[PDB]
Write an enzyme that holds these catalytic residues in place. Structure first.
Site, PDB file in Angstrom:
ATOM      1  N   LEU A   1       0.847  -1.197   0.000  1.00 44.21           N
ATOM      2  CA  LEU A   1       0.000   0.000   0.000  1.00 44.21           C
ATOM      3  C   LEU A   1       0.873   1.234   0.000  1.00 44.21           C
ATOM      4  CD1 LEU A   1      -3.027  -0.928   2.279  1.00 44.21           C
ATOM      5  CD2 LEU A   1      -2.859  -0.976  -0.230  1.00 44.21           C
ATOM      6  N   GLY A   2       1.930   1.200   0.796  1.00 40.50           N
ATOM      7  CA  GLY A   2       2.912   2.272   0.909  1.00 40.50           C
ATOM      8  C   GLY A   2       4.043   1.945   1.857  1.00 40.50           C
TER       9      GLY A   2
ATOM     10  N   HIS B   1      10.403   5.117   5.723  1.00 45.59           N
ATOM     11  CA  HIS B   1      11.810   4.778   5.887  1.00 45.59           C
ATOM     12  C   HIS B   1      12.013   3.437   6.596  1.00 45.59           C
ATOM     13  CE1 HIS B   1      16.104   6.185   7.207  1.00 45.59           C
ATOM     14  NE2 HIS B   1      16.169   5.282   6.225  1.00 45.59           N
TER      15      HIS B   1
ATOM     16  N   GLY C   1       9.134   1.458   8.018  1.00 46.83           N
ATOM     17  CA  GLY C   1       7.951   0.599   7.986  1.00 46.83           C
ATOM     18  C   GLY C   1       7.239   0.543   6.661  1.00 46.83           C
TER      19      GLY C   1
ATOM     20  N   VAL D   1       3.144  -0.667   4.866  1.00 49.90           N
ATOM     21  CA  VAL D   1       1.776  -1.118   5.046  1.00 49.90           C
ATOM     22  C   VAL D   1       1.400  -1.946   3.814  1.00 49.90           C
ATOM     23  CG1 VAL D   1      -0.671  -0.418   5.319  1.00 49.90           C
ATOM     24  CG2 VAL D   1       1.133   0.764   6.582  1.00 49.90           C
TER      25      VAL D   1
ATOM     26  N   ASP E   1       3.522  13.889  13.409  1.00 50.75           N
ATOM     27  CA  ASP E   1       3.719  13.544  11.987  1.00 50.75           C
ATOM     28  C   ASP E   1       2.440  13.837  11.182  1.00 50.75           C
ATOM     29  OD1 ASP E   1       5.614  12.416  10.080  1.00 50.75           O
ATOM     30  OD2 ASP E   1       4.734  10.412  10.282  1.00 50.75           O
TER      31      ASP E   1
END
Ligand SMILES: COc1cc2[nH]ncc2cc1-c1[nH]ncc1NC(=O)c1cnn2cccnc12
Length: 280
Positions: A17-18, A21, A23, A25, A129
């Site tokens: 999904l994305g 740096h 981690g 998903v 964030d």
């Protein structure tokens, strides 16, 4: 059987999904019957920080709000299991859906982000964030805060958390106190919301991103002096320009997010009142 305990053997990866740096998903199907009928889930795992992911899992497990992504469980090394939102991040969605999303819907998304953030603040947490890349699209009518990777608890009777590791910092979304002293207040999240609102209003256009716009304001050849030049420009009273086609009244709410002192800085409750008045 614990409904929040997902077995690795049944968690089938479909696609990425994305990634950040440290981690990533992934879309998975939790398929215990082995016939591709199981529920689709979003799975957060670290790239091959473990302590930080465990803390993030405990924070998300205790957050219950319509504009906060739903925790589903864990896969124990650990993976965070969450509900899957097919429309992805606001950063990916807005450039592809400009025809579907008008100013009224952008302001409704703005209110929804403020509500999720106001709830997080009430639980004494600071996000650190807040950006469009961390907001997920549930439908054309709803958004949710979708990641808590940098989220930290703010001590009682204290106004801030003291950050030791600034290495994963989105400096172009950071308030001046974060840049100068790594002091993270709930007011520091209001500053980042104003930057996220600018992104939302520009439909997350890459050429008009906060990074692209600040680099034009401060100069792009300062290298290691970049954050110092960014601090200087903010101390001068310079701010991100008004998004094209953004009404001055919406820009005025945005400017209130960017009061230099984390005191002349409003709350999320205050911003919700502002947007609701514009919607009526
Ligand atoms: C907030 O989005 C991300 C968060 C991240 N953290 N680390 C990597 C990372 C990547 C993303 C990301 N980048 N582009 C899209 C997405 N995420 C999703 O499409 C998504 C759908 N449901 N869902 C549920 C929880 C989290 N993400 C999701």
């Amino acid at each position: 059987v614990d409904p929040t305990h997902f077995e690795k053997r049944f968690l089938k990866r479909i696609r990425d999904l994305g990634e950040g740096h440290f981690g990533k998903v992934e879309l998975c199907r939790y398929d215990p019957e082995g016939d591709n009928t199981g529920e689709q889930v979003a799975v957060k795992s670290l790239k091959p920080h473990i302590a930080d992911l465990k803390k993030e899992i405990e924070i998300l497990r205790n957050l219950y709000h319509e504009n906060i992504v739903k925790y589903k469980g864990i896969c124990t090394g650990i993976k965070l299991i969450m509900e899957f939102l097919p429309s992805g991040s606001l950063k990916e969605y807005l450039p592809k859906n400009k025809n579907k999303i008008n100013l009224k819907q952008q302001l409704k998304y703005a209110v929804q982000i403020c509500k999720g953030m106001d709830y997080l603040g009430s639980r004494q947490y600071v996000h650190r964030d807040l950006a469009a890349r961390n907001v997920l699209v549930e439908s054309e009518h709803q958004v949710k805060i979708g990641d808590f990777g940098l989220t930290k608890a703010i001590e009682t009777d204290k106004e801030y958390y003291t950050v030791k590791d600034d290495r994963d910092s989105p400096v172009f979304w950071y308030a001046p106190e974060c840049l100068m002293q790594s002091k993270f207040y709930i007011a520091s999240d209001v500053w980042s919301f104003g930057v996220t609102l600018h992104e939302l209003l520009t439909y997350c256009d890459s050429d008009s991103s906060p990074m692209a716009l600040f680099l034009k304001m401060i100069g792009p050849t300062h290298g290691q002096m970049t954050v110092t030049r960014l601090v200087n420009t903010l101390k001068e009273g310079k701010r991100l320009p008004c998004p094209p086609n953004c009404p001055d009244e919406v820009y005025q709410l945005m400017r209130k997010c960017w009061e230099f002192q984390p005191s002349n800085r409003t709350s999320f409750q205050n911003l919700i009142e502002g947007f609701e008045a514009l919607l009526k």
